[PDB]
């Protein structure tokens, strides 16, 4: 049984790693099919005591990752793609 001080800490609004489909971040590339089809990015996450508040980035960045894009029964090439990562998060109003 995890204590409350544990729980509380574990819930804090901070940059958590999350799984995103490449299709979601780069939807304009329909012809392509990626390996892996999803990637892990640090994004703001967790909660604020006040439910009038909201967990939001205060400092984003761009990162580049290597992805294998195969094109419908044609070719396959390693593709460098840019994603947005959250460097700092914060509890703000709505």
């Amino acid at each position: 049984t995890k204590g409350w001080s544990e729980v509380l800490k574990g819930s804090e609004c901070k940059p958590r790693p999350i799984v995103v489909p490449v299709s979601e971040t780069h939807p304009e590339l329909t012809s392509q099919r990626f390996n892996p089809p999803c990637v892990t990015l640090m994004r703001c996450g967790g909660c604020c005591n006040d439910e009038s508040l909201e967990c939001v980035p205060t400092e984003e960045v761009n990162v580049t990752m290597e992805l294998l894009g195969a094109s419908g029964s044609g070719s396959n090439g390693m593709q460098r793609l840019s994603f947005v990562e959250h460097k700092k998060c914060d509890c703000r109003p709505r």
Partner: protein, 187 residues
Amino acid sequence: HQHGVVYITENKNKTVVIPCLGSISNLNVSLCARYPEKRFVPDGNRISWDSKKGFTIPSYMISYAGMVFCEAKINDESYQSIMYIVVVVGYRIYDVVLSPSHGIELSVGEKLVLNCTARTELNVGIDFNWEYPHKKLVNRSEMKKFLSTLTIDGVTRSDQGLYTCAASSGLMTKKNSTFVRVHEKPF
């Protein structure tokens, strides 16, 4: 040791006081909050501390933090209070209403499902209490919405009568009922 509680009002900007009590008039006291960690200091204007009242600070400044605690460092040692847990809570209920709102004519054997809906501010908890003549209950934009659903599967003719729904924020309560007439299967 133990922990304490500090209640944030429905109205931020209003000042809250943490009962970190002292004995040294001139004690230089701070207040740490989590999570994430922040530390506050009196500014004479809005933020203060009093030997016999304790740390006073605008609730909007710490509303986010699950916990807070006074702190002070004298000589070679720093000590700080017990953990005070922040409780952010609301109590306003805008309106209570159910569907159908109007009159209701039914007949024996039919099923009935009544939906009760609470419209409240934020940080509100609601308790649903009904009133009526084999019946099942289930509970679940700058506003908060709550809903309870009552179902009777094979109504008898003695299910005819007034059905009142009451929603409670904990200090405020609101009703809104409807009458349900029932007859025998037509023809």
